[PDB]
Structure formats: structure tokens, C-alpha cells
Design a protein around this ligand. Structure first.
Ligand SMILES: N=C(N)c1ccc2c(c1)[C@@H](c1ccccc1)C[C@@H](c1cc(N)cc(-c3ccccc3C(=O)O)c1)N2
Ligand SMILES: [Ca+2]
Lengths: 55, 254
């Protein structure tokens, strides 16, 4: 699943035994109930530009 | 940076400036509050290991605006496979003496997972390269941080396109090509160690390190970048470990 369009994950993808797929996020992010989206859990998460985010 | 533009202040917040005795040495990339990734070759001539400083939140070298944070570099970790005076395995991991404080102007770039980087990031066409390096081949360095958008090339395409020029070195599996062969745009000396940052679904990730090339923005040639995906596990293991005495550390690779 992870081989095709990152398994639909916004960040990291893990393939599991059978048709099972688990998306994961970098530290400072949490996975939403959709199981694919990552939302920041800190004020300065990695890879985001505050002056542009606040704009 | 050749043929790029001024990075608007705070738009490359992971950009690091490395100084030795207060003089510009290389660039780097902040990947969390205490770790910086740079190029191994930047440390080939250091004797003054105790006066290596990393500056975060820097933008304009002529003025102090209060957003700059300076830290002493406590350790420089280089892979065992790196040979001084060469271009291969061109990566260094730097531990700061104390963490930088994250602000709107100081933010880490995400160091991605290996598989995500190899199967997804490696196929994002354009990425940003930045630094205070030479604005022209044999020219003056920049006072304001510069940025350039570059497309990534498959190594075979880079090799066939990058002219049969005598002693044209090998582009290894630990490198990748990015840029333009028309002589207009490239990274240059002074940008070494700096980030090649890739955007994917609203987040930026570290995929390359400004490493080498044949001159700057030379016709038929591309910039050569360290392929960071090969080093993820190596970097992660070192970051989870306790500091050791001595500034320079050679760590086995793989
Ligand atoms: N075209 C590119 N994208 C590109 C990017 C970086 C580099 C090149 C090209 C090579 C190059 C080759 C010929 C002419 C111009 C550039 C030289 C190579 C390098 C290696 C070493 N060992 C020291 C320094 C070096 C020496 C003095 C000051 C700064 C540096 C610094 O590290 O940037 C620089 N780095
Ligand atoms: Ca300044």
C-alpha cells in the first residue's frame, strides 16, 4: 500500500501483514481520526514556516 | 547561490551559518533543537575546533536584528567512509553546546524516514537550496541569505548530460544531481553544507546537502548534493546516543 502514493499518508507509511496500512507522523505531530493527516502538537513543528503559517 | 533570490527573512528558518573564528565557513541545516547537519568537507582544514560557532535565525550578515542565536559546536561527527579531500560520503552531524530556542525565525527542517524519502521525496521534482555563498563563480559572497529552486535529476540522466569532460568524477549512490545545465542557476562555494529542502503535503524535509560540482552554474553541469536518505539510520543512531569527549568524532558507516 505504502509503495503507491505513500499509502495515502500525509507523512510516514508502514505496511502491515495483509491489506493493513498505518500512517505515522514525525515527532511534534499527531495523526487525525482519518488515519492519514498529521496535525502539529507543538508551537514550532519541524518543516513549517511560521511567518507563512500565520499569514 | 547563483541566479537565485533573497530568501525573505524567516522563510528558510532551518538555515544555519557556520563560523570559524567569526569568519564564514559553510552552511548547515537545523534538524531539531541541538543537531545540525552539514558537509564533512567543511571540516577538512579546521585546527581551531574550539572556535566553531553555529548561527541560527541569521538573515543579513551586516546587521544584528536580535533574532540570531549563536551556539558553540560541541561535536562534529563524520562517517568513517568519508576521506578528507574527496567528495563522497559528504555529511557531518553537529551537536550544539546548548539547544537553540525555537522562534518564528528558528525552526528545524524535518529529517524524514528513509523509505518515505526514497519512495516519495526522491520523486518531488523541485527543491530549495540556500546559502550565503558566492553569487557568481569567482565572485563575492552574499550579505543576505539567498534561495534557489532546483529540479532533481536521475543520476544516469545527469551523467549522459554532464559532458565527457576529463577527470569528471563519479556520481555515487551517496549523491544526486540537481539544477540546470544552461549556466544560469546553481549553488556555489560558501553554500556547502546547506540544505536541499523538499516540500511534501504542506511540510519541508531534508533530502540533500550542498556538496560539490564542476565550478558554479557551468554549462553542461549540475550541482551535486549528498543523498541524505542513505544516512537517516546513521544520523538517528548518533542522535540517540550520549556525547563523547573530543570535538571531532568518526563514526562507523553503515
Ligand atoms: N556547483 C555546485 N553546486 C558547488 C557547490 C559546492 C562546492 C562546489 C560546487 C565546488 C566548486 C568547484 C570549483 C569551483 C567552484 C565550486 C567546490 C566545493 C568545495 C570543496 C572544498 N573541499 C572546499 C570548498 C570551499 C572552499 C572555500 C570556501 C568555501 C568552500 C565551501 O565548502 O563551499 C568548496 N563546494
Ligand atoms: Ca544579522
Amino acid at each position: 500500500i505504502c509503495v503507491n502514493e505513500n499509502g495515502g499518508c500525509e507523512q510516514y507509511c508502514s505496511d502491515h501483514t495483509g491489506t493493513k496500512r498505518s500512517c505515522r507522523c514525525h515527532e511534534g505531530y499527531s495523526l487525525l481520526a482519518d488515519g492519514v493527516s498529521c496535525t502539529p502538537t507543538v508551537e514550532y513543528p519541524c518543516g513549517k514556516i511560521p511567518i507563512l503559517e500565520k499569514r | 547561490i547563483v541566479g537565485g533570490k533573497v530568501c525573505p527573512k524567516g522563510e528558510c528558518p532551518w538555515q544555519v551559518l557556520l563560523l570559524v573564528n567569526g569568519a564564514q565557513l559553510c552552511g548547515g541545516t537545523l534538524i531539531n533543537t541541538i543537531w545540525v547537519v552539514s558537509a564533512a568537507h567543511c571540516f577538512d582544514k579546521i585546527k581551531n575546533w574550539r572556535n566553531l560557532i553555529a548561527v541560527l535565525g541569521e538573515h543579513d550578515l551586516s546587521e544584528h536584528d536580535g533574532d540570531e542565536q549563536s551556539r558553540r559546536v560541541a561535536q562534529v561527527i563524520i562517517p568513517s567512509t568519508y576521506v578528507p579531500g574527496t567528495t563522497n560520503h559528504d555529511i557531518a552531524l553537529l551537536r550544539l553546546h546548548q539547544p537553540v530556542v525555537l522562534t518564528d525565525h528558528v525552526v528545524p527542517l524535518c529529517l524524514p524516514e528513509r523509505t518515505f524519502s526514497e519512495r516519495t521525496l526522491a520523486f518531488v521534482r523541485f527543491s530549495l537550496v540556500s546559502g550565503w555563498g558566492q553569487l557568481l563563480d569567482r565572485g563575492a559572497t552574499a550579505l543576505e541569505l539567498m534561495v534557489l529552486n532546483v529540479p532533481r535529476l536521475m543520476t544516469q540522466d545527469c551523467l549522459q548530460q554532464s559532458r565527457k569532460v576529463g577527470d569528471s568524477p563519479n556520481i555515487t549512490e551517496y549523491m544526486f544531481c540537481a539544477g540546470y545545465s544552461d549556466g544560469s542557476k546553481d549553488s556555489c562555494k560558501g553554500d556547502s553544507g546547506g540544505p536541499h529542502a523538499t516540500h511534501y503535503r504542506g511540510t519541508w524535509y531534508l533530502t540533500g546537502i550542498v556538496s560539490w560540482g564542476q565550478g558554479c552554474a557551468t554549462v553542461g553541469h549540475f550541482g551535486v548534493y549528498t543523498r541524505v536518505s542513505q544516512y537517516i539510520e546513521w544520523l538517528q543512531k548518533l542522535m540517540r546516543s550520549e556525547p563523547r569527549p573530543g570535538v571531532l568524532l568518526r563514526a562507523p558507516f553503515p
